[PDB]
């Protein structure tokens, strides 16, 4: 009789092609996805991500002796029967209904199956509120109710009765209220994922006492106060991850107990108001891989030792907005896998360490707006790979090489004291912004084949002399140009008006002379200032309306046949 | 960041052939490090250049949360649809270029609240309706090239429209 019951489930799902072998072929135990006990009755139904579709069958309740039931990842929809707990079975322990398209609310009869060990109604389309009766399953070992379309509701207090949980994945369920005080009494937790919600209160000082945690994640909440972990209670040596990520109101100094975890791999404590000095204890953990403290009010200095160990895993450092002072750590890239360093908008001073300029694994250096000084080593532009350099608003000095890296694509060295000559080949560059520097010498002859991908160039305030290259017109996708406050002389290129997307041309306060190019008028220009020069002749018709008023002022030899500072021919 | 979300929503509603928006990662905090986006010193989007890049699809109504936008360029593309009514919420807009496209509909009333506009070109489009009178309240407007369309009605002759010559409104038989 079990054959008809088993095939009825397939008939309900309109005979999916996956279960094509379920056609009266003797015993049903050799059928795929079906397992029988010694008596022949079905004990496991594993149909994970097979492809079935349709409503939840009601004939499964006739499969007495069912012990494992997995229907995750399929396209099942509809509504779970209200009498699921009265007929589905009595020997099941692995109910897994997750990732489906189930509608409606969670049935309250699920408390009548007190033998479960795993219940995962997550990533569904449920609605309402988490029932209190769900706390009656004292034998639970993994409960995941996440990413559901719930309403404003607080976790029931009956959840304090679950003292054997191993995974609490309540990620996104519209929660409010205070932080649960019974979490610290579940002395078996391995993953705690109370995630983006509206919870409020202070992090208890007893949650750090469970010596079985492996992942701590509280991303977006309304927690206040400060982490007040006390001495003599730190025992979570197996903790791997801490992600107090964004609460906007956490205060107090960073706890000193975070520098004694021999397995920590990710520390994220940004978007808060932590103060005090970053503890020096975290510079010797031979497991750290990511340290992120984007925005805070931390003072003091970076830890002196960071990555000195040759066998470590430090690859990411990111402190993007703080009040940190001091000097960059010396031995950062000693293991040989360092890939990033972000210390923008800080008050560190000193110079670029020699170790950081020779690490041939770098990917992204983002030091800026600090008070650095000294001279940048010449090896920083040759040995390490580099795709994003943002050294802005410093007092650095140096000299760029003739040829840059083949994959450099962003260079912001504005407001510095760099010297030397302009690089002649930086294939792959798309943003060369460098103003108020000390560059000198004639600009490179071609500058149109070594940088064919340039999109924005700025060289105002330099000391370059010579003439404008004629190959600049060969840069197809260039939008912004600026060579003002220089000593350039010669003639404006006649092909400068033939490029495609030129929209910003600033060539003021120079020593140029000659006639304004006519085809310059036929451009989508939105800004232009060819003033304070030694140009001669007449303004071409079209670039003379009231829009271009303060553009040609200061030219004694210029006249119009509406403008300020321009005489009449 | 709301500006990043708005730009990503614009990306989702636009189809690209040669993948000019490959670097618009939504996970980044600020969108200034993106390509084709220029910011000021305070990490605010103040320029978006997307001219002569093969694109298609339609704009979105989320292009109104960029308060500090100053130059919006989306010309020489294959975009089609209607101009969003929220474009008048950009109080600091200085130059609005949308020419050489396949737009249709009508010039929104909301493009009269902009008191800093200087350029307004809508060449080679398929807009219809009538020219709003609110354009006369923009005293700072200097360049206007509403031509090659299907507009109608009466041409305004008061305010800043007095200085404009007939070349501004050309190839409009129903005007």
């Amino acid at each position: 009789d079990d054959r008809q019951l088993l095939i009825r489930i397939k008939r309900v799902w309109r005979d999916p092609p996956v279960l094509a072998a379920w056609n009266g072929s003797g015993d049903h135990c050799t059928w795929p996805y079906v397992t029988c006990d010694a008596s022949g009755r079905v004990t496991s139904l594993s149909l994970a991500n097979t492809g079935v579709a349709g409503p939840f069958p009601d004939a499964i309740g006739g499969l007495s002796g069912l012990t494992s039931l997995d229907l995750s990842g399929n396209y099942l929809d509809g509504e779970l029967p209200a009498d699921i707990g009265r007929a589905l079975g009595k020997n099941l322990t692995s109910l897994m209904l997750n990732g489906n398209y189930f509608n409606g609310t969670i049935p309250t009869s699920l408390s009548r199956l007190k033998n479960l060990q795993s219940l995962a109604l997550d990533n569904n389309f449920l609605a309402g509120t988490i029932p209190a009766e769900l706390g009656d399953l004292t034998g639970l070992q993994m409960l995941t109710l996440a990413n559901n379309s719930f309403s404003v509701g607080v976790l029931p207090a009956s959840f304090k009765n679950l003292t054997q949980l191993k995974t609490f994945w309540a990620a996104i369920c519209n929660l409010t209220g205070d932080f649960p005080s019974y979490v610290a009494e579940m002395r078996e937790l391995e993953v705690l994922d109370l995630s983006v919600n509206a919870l409020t209160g202070s992090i208890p000082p007893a949650i750090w006492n469970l010596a079985k945690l492996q992942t701590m994640a509280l991303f977006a909440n309304n927690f206040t106060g400060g982490v007040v972990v006390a001495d003599g209670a730190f025992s979570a040596v197996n903790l791997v991850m801490i992600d107090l990520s964004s609460n906007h109101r956490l205060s107090g100094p960073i706890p000193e107990a975070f520098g004694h975890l021999p397995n920590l791999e990710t520390l994220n404590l940004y978007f808060n108001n932590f103060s005090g000095e970053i503890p020096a204890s975290i510079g010797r953990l031979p497991s750290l891989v990511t340290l992120s403290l984007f925005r805070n009010r931390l003072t003091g200095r970076l830890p002196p030792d960071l990555g000195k160990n040759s066998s470590a895993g430090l690859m990411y450092i990111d402190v993007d907005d703080n009040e940190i002072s001091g000097a960059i750590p010396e031995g950062l890239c000693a293991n040989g896998k360092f890939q990033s360093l972000i210390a923008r908008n800080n008050r560190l001073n000193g110079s670029i360490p020699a170790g950081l300029a020779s690490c041939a694994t770098l990917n992204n250096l983002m030091l800026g707006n600090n008070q650095l000084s000294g001279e940048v080593p010449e090896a920083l532009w040759t040995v390490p790979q580099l795709e994003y350099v943002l050294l802005r608003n410093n007092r650095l000095s140096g000299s760029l090489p003739v040829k840059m890296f083949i994959n450099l694509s962003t260079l912001h060295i504005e407001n510095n004291q760099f010297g030397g000559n302009i690089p002649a080949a930086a294939v792959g560059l798309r943003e060369f912004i460098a103003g108020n520097n000390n560059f000198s010498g004639e600009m490179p002859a071609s500058l149109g084949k070594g940088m064919p991908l340039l999109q924005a160039m700025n060289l105002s305030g330099n000391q370059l002399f010579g003439g404008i290259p004629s190959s600049v017109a060969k840069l197809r996708l260039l939008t912004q140009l600026d060579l003002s406050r220089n000593q350039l002389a010669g003639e404006i290129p006649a092909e400068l008006g033939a490029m495609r997307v030129l929209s910003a041309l600033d060539l003021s306060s120079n020593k140029l002379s000659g006639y304004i190019p006519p085809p310059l008028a036929g451009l989508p220009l939105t800004f232009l200032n060819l003033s304070s020069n030694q140009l001669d002749g007449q303004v071409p018709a079209g670039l003379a309306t009231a829009a271009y008023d303060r553009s040609f002022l200061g030219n004694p030899g210029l006249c119009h046949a509406y403008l300020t500072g321009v005489r009449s021919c | 960041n709301t500006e990043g979300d708005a730009l990503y929503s614009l990306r989702q509603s636009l189809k690209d052939a040669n993948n000019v928006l490959q670097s618009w990662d939504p996970t980044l905090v600020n969108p200034c490090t993106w390509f084709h986006v220029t910011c000021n010193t305070d990490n605010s989007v103040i320029r978006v250049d997307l001219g002569n890049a093969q694109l298609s699809g339609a704009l979105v109504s989320q292009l109104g949360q960029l308060k500090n936008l100053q130059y919006l360029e989306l010309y020489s593309n294959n975009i089609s649809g209607t101009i969003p009514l929220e474009l008048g919420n950009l109080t600091n807009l200085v130059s609005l270029d949308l020419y050489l496209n396949k737009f249709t509909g009508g010039i929104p009333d909301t493009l009269g609240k902009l008191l800093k506009l200087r350029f307004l070109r809508l060449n080679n489009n398929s807009l219809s309706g009538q020219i709003p009178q609110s354009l006369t309240n923009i005293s700072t407007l200097q360049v206007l090239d509403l031509s090659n369309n299907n507009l109608s009605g009466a041409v305004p002759s008061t305010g800043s429209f007095s200085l404009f010559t007939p070349i501004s409104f050309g190839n409009n038989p129903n005007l």
Binding site: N49, S72, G73, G99, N100, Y101, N123, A146, N147, T167, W169, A171, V191, L192, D193, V196, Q214, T215, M216, A217, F219, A220, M241, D243, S245, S246, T266, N268, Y270, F271, S292, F294, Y316, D318, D320, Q339, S340, I342, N363, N364, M366, E387, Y388 | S23, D25, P26, T27, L28, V29, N30, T33
Partner: peptide, 27 residues
């Protein structure tokens, strides 16, 4: 399946243009 995410997956908000995959920017 329907979507990603599992257990204690990390957050996504970073300034790094080249970061390991995984996460969604919350905050």
């Amino acid at each position: 399946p329907r979507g990603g995410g599992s257990a204690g997956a990390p957050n996504g908000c970073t300034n790094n243009p080249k970061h390991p995959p995984g996460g969604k920017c919350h905050g």
